[PDB]
């Protein structure tokens, strides 16, 4: 499903959309740095 | 249709394009009845280059024998090929079969036989081939010095 869309936009279409879409090709969300606090409690359990 | 001896009906049933197994059975049946005609067509549709040539090279004018041996020339089925082309004093593709296979010496040799003096070119191409195919003491690159002999050495 994703492919039919993604493919068709690259293959078929202008790629105005494709171009726009890649701004680096970044992740879906940018959170904080989750690991370190998690790790602090988790180790001497 | 084979049983009835209805060659024509068996022929439609095979169907001209492929069904070679049908045609090989028909071709033999046609040779048995000594109906060569139906047989040549069955063998064509069958393809059967080795067999097809035998019926076909009995021509003495090579009328439909080159096609069924065109491949044979360059497949190393040289033997099938030579009979096809040399059959009425003509060099139809006799020489050519020999070049194609890499049996270059044999084309030179043929050329000498019927002497239109084409030998000079074939011997050269061949001689060159000896130098590449590691011969140094029979290297051939001369006109008569290093083994083999280009056309002025040769004669009719």
């Amino acid at each position: 499903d994703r492919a039919t869309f993604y493919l068709n936009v690259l293959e078929q279409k202008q790629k105005a959309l494709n171009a726009g879409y890649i701004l680096n090709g970044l992740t879906v969300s940018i959170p904080g740095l989750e690991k370190a606090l998690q790790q602090y409690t988790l180790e001497p359990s | 249709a084979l049983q009835l001896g209805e060659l024509k009906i068996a022929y439609q049933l095979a169907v001209e394009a492929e069904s070679e197994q049908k045609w090989k059975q028909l071709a033999e049946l046609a040779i048995s009845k000594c109906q060569f005609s139906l047989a040549q067509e069955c063998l064509h549709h069958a393809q059967d280059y080795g067999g097809l040539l035998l019926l076909a090279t009995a021509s003495g004018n090579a009328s439909m024998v080159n096609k069924l041996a065109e491949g044979a020339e360059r497949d190393g089925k040289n033997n099938v090929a030579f009979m096809s082309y040399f059959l009425q004093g003509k060099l139809d593709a006799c020489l050519e079969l020999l070049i194609r296979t890499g049996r270059l010496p044999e084309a030179a040799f043929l050329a000498r036989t019927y002497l239109p003096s084409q030998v000079s070119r074939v011997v050269k191409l061949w001689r060159e081939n000896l130098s590449k195919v590691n011969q140094k003491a029979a290297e051939s690159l001369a006109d008569p010095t290093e083994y083999e002999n280009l056309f002025p050495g040769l004669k009719e």
């Binding site: 039919t4 869309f5 959309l17 879409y21 992740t27 | -």
Partner: protein, 813 residues
């Protein structure tokens, strides 16, 4: 005495003792130690002395026993003569009134092809010329033939002695008991006589006549022997499209797979083949005969199809038989495979009809939906059948049960454009009770594409949009999906436009619409909102938008080639995937030479010294998987001797207990502390010991998964492709470059080799050689290749890693 090789001193003592039992036991103990292969000549005079003339059979039989397994070797008490201590007083043995001693004597005497016993075996046929048993007459034809074999192919063995010399074979035919040792090279008259004998047979004897002369004009004439030949003869007179219906082949055939399900599975295969010869398309393979059990009259009682139903299986008999059976339903009846796979799939795939075909494990359910659905994609007729069955799949109305159902059907719609308009209304229904991703994904796609057909959508979507469950992947699927098809053709309190609004919010935007979407933050990192956000140029309308994409199918989608398909029935496939389908000073100088394909290690042994090294012996050793094919054999290495001695070499053997280094070579000489010295000839490696074996892509893949190969090195001189240095070197560390793991294009095209070996090291060895040969503006390191390597605990991984660089040795003495 099971096997005790030092006991020969006690045996001599036991061999003569004045007690007959002890003597018998001793001689018996000798036999058992020789048969195993142990020491025996010390005894000989003792052994021979008690027994010789006597008609007392047991010792005589024992001595008679020992003369067919070692007579030639043992010589203390025998030596070499024409009338040896094997046969001199065994002319008495041959000429005793008791048949047993004579018979036994005849039997060993004639059995030997010995030339030091040729004369005594010839009139030894006397012992059995009179035939007190079937055994005596058989013993005789076999002994005359054995005499004929032993250098008497002419007149010493061919006529009669007084009744047989090569004529028991003739006599046997007409006598009450048969047995023809005449199989080759013997009288023509007897061969002829055996033919006559086919009629007046003796059954054991018939197997002997029959190995010699086979093919009958008859049906039979009687007895297992004739019967066994007969099925061979029948297969000749009707070869055509297998035997079809197995002849007398059936009896041995069951035992051929006694372990236990495999017989039925096989039997099922033959029975299916036999039914009919169909079209023979993709999985329609039934051969044998076209009509011999037909298929499908409408007046046939109680019909062919009853047996055909067995073959349609869920497991209805056991798993081995199941895998065979599913293929077999497909094989007799379908269009290809598609027709009978849809019927078969309808039974297997999840429903509200039966709860013996539904299960709450999501993948299996999903897979079963995809298998049913792939039949439509294959063949049109199936589209019409599939969609209503799919709606029944949905009707289960567990969150997950709907979910799996929705996921395939949505793919089917991509293939099957505005044909499945009807399904949408059914598909919405179970979308509200929800605890999973899958249901949201699928439903949102059906309801989304299908919008023109329906008008419900704010209401259906909205309960879910404000409901919870698991929602990662939901985002991706709803993002491309929600608006689609016809710009304003819905309305419940949100037309198609509200949907485009929603579709955009769910993708990554924000908007009050369907009482807000469940999540907005997309699935796996690459996907994002943006493509679709840009999209919907023309608001959810078939043009060049989401609708286009939705009502179109990505690349080619046909067959069961796995392009929107899954390749038969999901359960049968697991089994097919599983099937890997794997196929004292000493001086040495040395070089390896090959003449007339004989591979030899040339060694020259040199005594540069004036000192004595006599007692000189030369040996090449067996270390492990290295072996001598013949050691160097000269007694050289003498005062100022130069010698060339050749030791032949092999690379393949079985591990010996001595050291496992390079090549051991041993020269011996004078010295009493170091009588044997080990000194070397040029290099041979540990790597030899590995054994080459190969993998296919499936075996490679399985092993990749099975154990890690993270370990990599980059090896220089892998600049070249797989074929050149890398193959040759990989070969020497008994490896081989097989199948690929590459993905080549204009940006891709590292050469990839899948390697395998099965090392004699308790490990396999595998590797992938990736050759970094530039097919991009930024190569890894340019030409060179990185070899990712493993072995089963990666102890041979390392061998692969460095033995793909370089490797060469030469000398020129």
């Amino acid at each position: 005495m099971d096997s005790e090789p030092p006991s020969e001193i006690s045996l001599k003592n036991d061999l003569e003792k004045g007690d007959v039992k002890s003597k018998t036991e001793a001689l018996k103990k000798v036999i058992i130690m020789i048969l195993n292969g142990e020491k025996l000549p010390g005894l000989l005079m003792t052994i021979i002395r008690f027994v010789l003339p006597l008609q007392d059979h047991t010792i005589k039989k024992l001595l008679l026993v020992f003369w067919e397994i070692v007579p030639k070797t043992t010589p203390d008490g025998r030596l070499l003569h024409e009338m040896i201590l094997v046969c001199d007083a065994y002319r008495k043995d041959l000429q005793h009134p008791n048949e047993f001693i004579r018979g036994s004597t005849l039997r060993f005497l004639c059995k030997l092809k010995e030339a030091e016993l040729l004369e005594p075996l010839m009139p030894a046929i006397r012992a059995c010329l009179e035939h007190r048993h079937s055994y005596v007459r058989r013993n005789a034809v076999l002994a005359i033939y054995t005499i004929y074999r032993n250098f008497e192919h002419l007149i010493p063995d061919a006529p009669e002695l007084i009744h047989d010399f090569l004529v028991n074979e003739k006599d046997a035919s007409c006598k009450r008991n048969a047995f023809m040792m005449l199989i080759h090279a013997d009288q023509d008259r007897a061969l002829d006589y055996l033919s006559t004998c086919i009629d007046q047979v003796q059954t054991f004897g018939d197997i002997l006549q029959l190995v010699i002369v086979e093919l009958i004009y008859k049906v039979c004439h009687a007895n297992p022997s004739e019967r066994a030949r007969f099925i061979r003869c029948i297969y000749n007179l009707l070869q055509s499209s297998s035997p079809a219906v197995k002849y007398e082949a059936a009896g041995t055939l069951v035992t051929l797979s006694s372990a236990p399900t495999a017989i039925k599975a096989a039997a099922q295969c033959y029975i299916d083949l036999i039914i009919k010869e169909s079209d023979n398309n993709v999985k329609l393979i039934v051969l044998d005969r076209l009509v011999e059990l037909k298929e499908h009259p409408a007046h046939e009682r109680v019909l062919q199809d009853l047996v055909m139903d067995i073959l349609r299986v869920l497991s209805t008999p056991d798993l081995e038989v199941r895998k065979k059976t599913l293929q077999l339903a497909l094989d007799l009846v379908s269009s290809r495979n598609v027709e009978e796979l849809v019927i078969v799939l309808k039974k297997e795939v999840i429903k509200t009809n039966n709860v013996s075909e539904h299960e709450d494990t999501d993948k299996y359910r999903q897979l079963l939906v995809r298998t049913l659905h792939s039949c439509s994609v294959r063949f049109p007729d199936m589209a019409a059948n599939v969609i209503p069955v799919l709606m029944e799949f949905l009707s289960d109305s567990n969150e997950a049960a709907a979910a799996d159902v929705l996921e395939f059907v949505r793919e089917a719609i991509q293939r099957f454009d505005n044909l499945r308009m009807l399904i949408v209304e059914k598909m919405l229904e179970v979308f509200h009770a929800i605890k999973s991703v899958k249901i949201y994904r699928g439903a949102l796609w059906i309801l989304g594409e299908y919008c023109s057909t329906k008008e419900d959508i704010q209401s259906v979507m909205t309960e879910v949009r404000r409901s919870l469950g698991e929602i990662p992947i939901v985002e991706s699927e709803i993002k491309k999906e929600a608006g689609e098809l016809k710009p304003e053709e819905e309305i419940t309190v949100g037309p198609v436009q509200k949907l485009v609004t929603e579709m955009g919010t769910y993708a990554t935007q924000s908007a009050l619409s369907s009482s807000r979407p469940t999540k907005k933050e997309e699935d796996r990192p690459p996907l994002r909102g943006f493509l679709l956000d840009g999209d919907f140029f023309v608001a959810a309308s078939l043009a060049t938008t989401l609708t286009k994409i939705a009502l179109r199918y990505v690349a080619l989608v046909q067959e069961k080639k796995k392009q929107n398909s899954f390749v038969a029935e999901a359960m049968l496939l697991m089994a097919t995937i599983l099937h890997l389908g794997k196929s004292d000073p000493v001086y040495a100088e040395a070089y390896v030479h090959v003449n007339q394909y004989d591979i030899v290690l040339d060694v020259l042994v040199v005594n540069q010294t004036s000192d004595t090294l006599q007692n000189c012996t030369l040996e090449l050793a067996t270390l492990g998987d290295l072996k001598l094919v013949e050691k160097p054999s000269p007694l050289t290495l003498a005062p100022h001797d130069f010698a060339n001695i050749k030791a032949n070499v092999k690379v393949a053997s079985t591990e010996n207990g001595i050291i496992f280094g390079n090549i051991v070579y041993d020269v011996s000489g004078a010295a009493s502390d170091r009588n044997c010295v080990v000194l070397s000839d040029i290099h041979i490696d540990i790597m030899d010991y590995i054994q080459p074996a190969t993998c296919t892509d499936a075996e490679f893949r399985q092993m990749w998964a099975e154990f890690e190969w993270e370990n990599k090195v980059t090896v220089n001189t892998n600049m070249t492709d797989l074929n050149d240095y890398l193959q040759h070197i990989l070969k020497s560390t008994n490896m081989k470059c097989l199948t690929p793991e590459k993905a080549l294009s204009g940006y891709c095209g590292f050469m990839a080799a899948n390697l395998y070996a099965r090392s004699i090291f308790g490990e396999d060895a595998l590797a992938n050689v990736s050759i970094e040969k530039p097919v991009h503006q930024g190569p890894d390191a340019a030409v060179t290749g990185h070899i990712r390597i493993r072995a089963k605990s990666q102890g041979m991984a390392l061998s692969l890693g460095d033995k793909i660089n370089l490797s060469q040795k030469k000398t020129s003495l």
